Amino acid sequence: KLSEEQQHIIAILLDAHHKTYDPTYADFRDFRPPVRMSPLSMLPHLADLVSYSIQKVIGFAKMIPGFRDLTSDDQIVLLKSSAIEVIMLRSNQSFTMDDMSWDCGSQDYKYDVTDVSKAGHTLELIEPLIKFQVGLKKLNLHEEEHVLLMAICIVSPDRPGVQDAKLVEAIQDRLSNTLQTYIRCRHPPPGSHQLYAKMIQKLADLRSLNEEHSKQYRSLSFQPENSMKLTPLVLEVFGN
Amino acid sequence: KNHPMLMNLLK
Numbered sequence: 602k603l604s605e606e607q608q609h610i611i612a613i614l615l616d617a618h619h620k621t622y623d624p625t626y627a628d629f630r631d632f633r634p635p636v637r638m639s640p641l642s643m644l645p646h647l648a649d650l651v652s653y654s655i656q657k658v659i660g661f662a663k664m665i666p667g668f669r670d671l672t673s674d675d676q677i678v679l680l681k682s683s684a685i686e687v688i689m690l691r692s693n694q695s696f697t698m699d700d701m702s703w704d705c706g707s708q709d710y711k712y713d714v715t716d717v718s719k720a721g722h723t724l725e726l727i728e729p730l731i732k733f734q735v736g737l738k739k740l741n742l743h744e745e746e747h748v749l750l751m752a753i754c755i756v757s758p759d760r761p762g763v764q765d766a767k768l769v770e771a772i773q774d775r776l777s778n779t780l781q782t783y784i785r786c787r788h789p790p791p792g793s794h795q796l797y798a799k800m801i802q803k804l805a806d807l808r809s810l811n812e813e814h815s816k817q818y819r820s821l822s823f824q825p826e827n828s829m830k831l832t833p834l835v836l837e838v839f840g841n
Numbered sequence: 842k843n844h845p846m847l848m849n850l851l852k
């Protein structure tokens with residue numbers, strides 16, 4: 602029951618992800634070095650990771666079918682609101698259940714709760730974020746499902762400042778329908794059971810996560826010296 | 842709306 606257009610969409614999203622997500626993490630050498638010794642010692646390194654990750658997310662978004670039809674202003678508002686959420690989603694691929702940390706192929710680039718804390722973020726974001734990663738990890742999505750969830754997250758009609766809500770909604774619905782149809786046709790029970798609903802529930806968790814991130818960003822960002830450590834893209838996207 | 846870097850990357 603999976604249409605040719607739907608398989609097309611999946612092929613494109615997979616490729617787009619492959620182009621935007623490097624499982625070697627080779628580019629991490631370019632970031633300011635991580636410092637675990639010290640308040641905000643990880644802030645420069647993780648600010649660079651985030652900023653880099655924002656770029657990669659933008660490049661994935663552009664590849665999504667129908668995203669280009671949207672106005673530039675609509676494209677900007679969608680990316681601005683979703684950026685953090687997609688980064689949290691995409692981060693699942695580095696996240697490991699064994700040690701509860703994000704493992705990027707090296708001990709230096711292996712990030713735990715204390716490293717995140719060293720970035721200036723409270724347990725109020727981090728505890729629910731780790732839970733999110735565990736629950737997402739538990740789902741064991743196919744890669745196809747992962748890429749589709751990211752795309753559906755970016756193209757959301759209810760994001761603040763959207764103008765063409767009717768059009769953003771039409772794009773999303775095609776991707777949602779593609780996902781629903783994929784699970785049914787390609788995803789075997791029992792893992793399939795309630796999988797779409799569970800994935801949609803992850804999008805709601807991401808909104809909460811986003812909201813908290815904003816608050817902690819606003820506090821951290823509010824002091825000038827901490828804001829100095831950030832990148833210019835981070836300042837623009839997350840607000841100056 | 843004052844997002845030059847984002848607009849450029851988007852383009």
Ligand SMILES: C=C1[C@H](O)CC(=C/C=C2\CCC[C@]3(C)[C@@H]([C@H](C)C(=O)/C=C/C=C/C)CC[C@@H]23)C[C@H]1O
Nearest residue numbers: 644647648651654688689691692695703712717720
């Ligand atoms: C290419 C990848 C993803 O884009 C991302 C990766 C990890 C994401 C992490 C691991 C460390 C904690 C982070 C960075 C969270 C915190 C709350 C965060 O946003 C940091 C902000 C720091 C600002 C200075 C959000 C995503 C979290 C590594 C890799 O899989």
